[PDB]
């Protein structure tokens, strides 16, 4: 049988320029090339892209963040390209040492560069957030994407900003390095008495695992009913077809209850969003309220 | 004992219980209330209440949908009870492929085509879609179509394409009598020398429901077509060779 | 009780074993032969866990813990209370999981749908068997498997991981984590996109899929499409579990050092091992 994991016959046509709605068409790029390689798995069309003020601002600060880290890595490499390549995963831009508290007066080589990099990252992410709101509004859509993005932003905000502020020093924040931020993560668990025993960490794991469970279930389900047009989910919401009915009956007969075509996407959005929402709470409470999760756990069983 | 972390984790569980209650009732907007196998409302409807109605305003002047609402199959269902108790299969009384029951079921969707964002038919034959062409893989046009009995049933004359998605959805197949049928892309194997259709024997191709316009297919028609072809996996397996 | 549209689907047939003997429903639940098999393995495994809890001395769920045999038992059988309950429960768990998947195949057949779902469930079964069967056998002992307890199996994760330093450094583990993270990101995006189209701004009609493609092209310059996103969701979640199983099957079998050592090959390659100054010089 055919499994519909890869397209059998690609078809190509004139590039789709998109819905207009209230989009300022001046800020839309031209259309890029089609990708036959991408066309085996999904759509082949590249672009156009919308680039307005927030997009340009986000890309700019974004690159500045990147360049600040990169220049520091070249400095740590004594400007030697071979030492650069050899030690790329080991370089790290660290926050100011605990002595500088929340002061912005740390010398560049001593954490000043970290604050400058973090400023750029902060502008890039928040202007990108505004962009996901405005791109939806210009098309008349709900704001679910911007809201879901706030949950990811929440954990990032807690890690780099809110928790270090509530702790009293930038030194509690996460360094910019491949291996060094892994070491940070492992040290964080040791210092706080084993994050496995932080109940919000356990919840976060349930939702992370549950996200893979749910997308496997839903991706497989839609593919299983694509022989009835099941992936055309919007029209199946408006006018239920046999794809939606078989999809629902598979799960009712299997586990005794089921979703609707619209409702499974509410299950999906909450499953994913709860990962970083509970995660952020669990990190926020570590060191501010609870110093040792295992010992706290022992008196709350 | 009652510290802030404790208050937060208790507060979250209360939140999560409310969220699950919301999520479950949101997922009751279709198919409920539950029915007995005679079609009358069941006594035990579960511990969750029906959600209050919500309205969608459909694009292109197609009206509104309010769910939940009084629902109906809007089609005859050719099945008979096989037991006095609940829980047993209902057996087809007739030809289940022709009667569209079981895995050959279809839903009385709107007899209108799905439209794209611009109000145009979403799915069109390639011969009516300017610019469209096979860009990779075996082009099936002109290839012979073979059923599960290894007999040829016709040849591919066109590809029906999802315009916004740039995706082949149906093969249009000409039968020995000159009429054509649509075959779902997901149900065929495009080979180098032929298209092989495992779900149907060659003589069941003519039973595929026909469309009432040569250049468009309605949602009702897609459901009848796809349900017929999928039901061949159970109901044509006698004629499926080895 | 039936969904309002359910009756036309409740036909006979599709079973792999036993014909019409188990071709019936209990409430919403389809049974089938593998429904019966699932029940048998589940009931027996739950009885065994009750027995184990009696032997343990507590009925608090947060303390029950069925441990596997001591390492000294190698791959041999063990007495019930010295690892044998763990062994029989693993047989029942395996039986129930596989029966569950074969029941799903019967449901797919009765409904005329693809077999994707039990195919995807099998990856989770594979991962479970990697931890309780494949890796213990390759290492020589059932005691390398994890215990069945709510908190003890977390301690096992922690002990196993720190045996090799920071498990973070396991490169198959990095790949697996990257898929798990990307999968939750893709799931949030996909749920938000559909809901934002079906529930648009106040005062607006329902959007079309064309609006979904346009939103994502405007946002990032590419739209994978409606079929593509479900293909991707399945691939991401399956790949995450696949590299999960990979990162454990090779740990303690063909790799025994601290995982950070695996990256010290790139560090001390002879044409730049000796350049001083930076991190590795
Ligand atoms: C996968 C790699 C590791 C591992 C690492 C971790 C870590 C780390 C954590 C967990 C956590 C949990 N793990 Mg574990 N876990 C493993 C293997 C398992 C197996 C198994 C048979 O393979 C099971 C059943 C569980 C079950 C569980 C839950 C108690 C809990 C939340 C999971 C969740 O929501 O997932 C997603 C699934 C769903 C959302 C769907 C619902 C699944 C339900 C909740 C399963 C409950 C099973 C029940 C407790 C036991 C059987 C009941 C029978 C009647 C006997 N783990 C292996 C050994 N697991 C977290 C926790 O809070 O632990 C206390 C946690 O922090
Ligand atoms: C030794 C290590 C410790 C440990 C220490 C920690 C710490 C410390 C943390 C976690 C966290 C998490 N851990 Mg833990 N963890 C351990 C063991 C485990 C085990 C296990 C098998 O035992 C599992 C399954 C997990 C799983 C998880 C996740 C559920 C959770 C991260 C959510 C997430 O998506 O973050 C990934 C997502 C983000 C960080 C958000 C990113 C959002 C921003 C906006 C993105 C900006 C992108 C930027 C612009 C660059 C873009 C590039 C562009 C593409 C061009 N941990 C042990 C006990 N874990 C986190 C948590 O929430 O804990 C409660 C956390 O902080
Ligand atoms: C959650 C608890 C810990 C944590 C624990 C872990 C663990 C454990 C692992 C990672 C891994 C990764 N983490 Mg981390 N990570 C945390 C917070 C962050 C933040 C942040 C904004 O706070 C960022 C940007 C990252 C970024 C990254 C990537 C380098 C990598 C893959 C992530 C992924 O799947 O993205 C999903 C997003 C996408 C697929 C979109 C595209 C994203 C691109 C690839 C990310 C670019 C980031 C950066 C600019 C890259 C420099 C690359 C070259 C080296 C020059 N982490 C916190 C502090 N993270 C994994 C890894 O491979 O580490 C080596 C890994 O094993
Ligand atoms: C201190 C601990 C160590 C560490 C040591 C380990 C070890 C050791 C292992 C992992 C493994 C994993 N780690 Mg690690 N890991 C650490 C830090 C992290 C961090 C982080 C943010 O720092 C992250 C994101 C991860 C991420 C992960 C995943 C890649 C993986 C867990 C998923 C999995 O295998 O599912 C697989 C899924 C399953 C096994 C579920 C099977 C379910 C079955 C088929 C059905 C169950 C049904 C149930 C019984 C019935 C329910 C009935 C209902 C109740 C009705 N680790 C630190 C450094 N990690 C594990 C792994 O890869 O395993 C292969 C593993 O063993
Ligand atoms: C609900 C929880 C999950 C989640 C959700 C989520 N993330 C989101 C969203 C949502 C709902 C968005 O809407 C938003 C988005 O736009 O997604 C497409 C976002 C997004 N999540 C991202 C990443 C991300 N999310 C993560 C996590 C998660 N996000 C959770 C699992 C992670 C991690 C660590 O797990 C990462 C890394 C981005 C893809 C995007 C946010 C975009 C953003 O903020 O951009 C600002 C920064 C820039 C514009 C800089 C870009 C350039 C770089 C400096 C590189 C330059 C390289 C070089 C100069 C050029 C090379 C060229 C050659 C290759 C040709
Ligand atoms: C492969 C991608 C992800 C995935 C996919 C997936 N899981 C699936 C499916 C799919 C596609 C199903 O179709 C199936 C299902 O029906 O879901 C509703 C299933 C499912 N995934 C489940 C759980 C689950 N999946 C998980 C993971 C994931 N599943 C992957 C990340 C996890 C974890 C820890 O990450 C869990 C907990 C179930 C809800 C369900 C399988 C139900 C099943 O097999 O039921 C038959 C068994 C019983 C009714 C009971 C058996 C009892 C045993 C005899 C005794 C107890 C043994 C056990 C070892 C004790 C463990 C103690 C713990 C504290 C360690
Ligand atoms: C687009 O599409 C989509 C949908 O749809 C539109 C969907 O819905 C879904 C589905 C997704 C959701 C509903 C979202 C929510 C789901 C999650 C968040 C995933 C997490 C799931 C859970 C936590 C729930 C998991 C619970 C399970 C596994 C089920 C509970 C467990 C049981 C009750 C098992 C019991 C069933 C068994 C054992 C099988 C057999 C049943 C029996 C009753 C056995 C009995 C045996 C007997 C011998 C009975 C004997 C009786 C006799 C003989 C009667 C004789 C008769 C006479 C009168 C003669 C998806 C993915 C989707 O993408
Ligand atoms: C040739 O090379 C050149 C020079 C071109 C390069 O540029 C090469 C570039 C590189 C090699 C880049 C390498 C980049 C990395 C390795 C990135 C790795 C980054 C991570 C793994 C991220 C770790 C986590 C980062 C976190 C948690 C950041 C938190 C940010 C804060 C939330 C923001 C808080 C804001 C502050 C402190 C500033 C306050 C100012 C305000 C206005 C609020
Ligand atoms: C003190 C600790 C609490 C957490 C701190 C703040 C963290 C920020 C997180 C935000 C909430 C998580 C996202 C909400 C769920 C996903 C979105 C959703 O489903 O609801 C949005 C929906 O209506 C549509 O929006 P509109 O179109 O505007 O109606
Ligand atoms: C029976 C169980 C009762 C438990 C105790 C009471 C409830 C506990 C406390 C709080 C739970 C709050 C859950 C709120 C869920 C989110 C609701 C919401 O977001 O509604 C608006 C939303 O639709 C708009 O979405 P769109 O229509 O897509 O724009
Ligand atoms: C000018 C050209 C620049 C090209 C730059 C390419 C950047 C690609 C980045 C992410 C793609 C992955 C997105 C995965 C998430 C998709 C969520 C979803 O549901 O999308 C459905 C579909 O797109 C609508 O129906
Ligand atoms: C929105 C879907 C709801 C999924 C619920 C998942 C329940 C997992 C419970 C994990 C328990 C963690 N902890 C530490 C509080 O015990
Ligand atoms: C932690 C995730 C599990 C959520 C449990 C959802 C319970 C739904 C059961 C509702 C019963 C539906 N029914 C059969 C009465 O129609
Ligand atoms: C957290 C585990 C979820 C288990 C849900 C059990 C299945 C739903 C119950 C069905 C009962 C049907 C009675 C009314 C029709
Ligand atoms: Fe979907």
Coordinates of C-alpha atoms in Angstrom, one line a residue, chain A residues 59-75 79 84 93 113 116-117 120-121:
Chain A
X59 CA 16.9 40.8 12.2
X60 CA 19.3 43.7 13.1
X61 CA 19.4 43.1 16.8
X62 CA 19.4 39.4 16.0
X63 CA 22.6 39.7 14.0
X64 CA 24.1 42.0 16.6
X65 CA 23.5 39.4 19.2
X66 CA 25.2 36.9 16.9
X67 CA 28.1 39.2 16.1
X68 CA 28.8 40.1 19.8
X69 CA 29.0 36.4 20.6
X70 CA 31.1 35.7 17.5
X71 CA 33.6 38.5 18.1
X72 CA 34.1 37.3 21.7
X73 CA 34.7 33.8 20.4
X74 CA 37.3 35.1 18.0
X75 CA 38.9 36.9 20.9
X79 CA 42.1 35.4 16.4
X84 CA 38.4 28.9 16.4
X93 CA 30.3 34.4 26.8
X113 CA 29.8 42.0 26.6
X116 CA 25.3 44.0 25.5
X117 CA 24.6 40.7 23.8
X120 CA 20.3 42.7 21.5
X121 CA 18.7 39.3 22.1

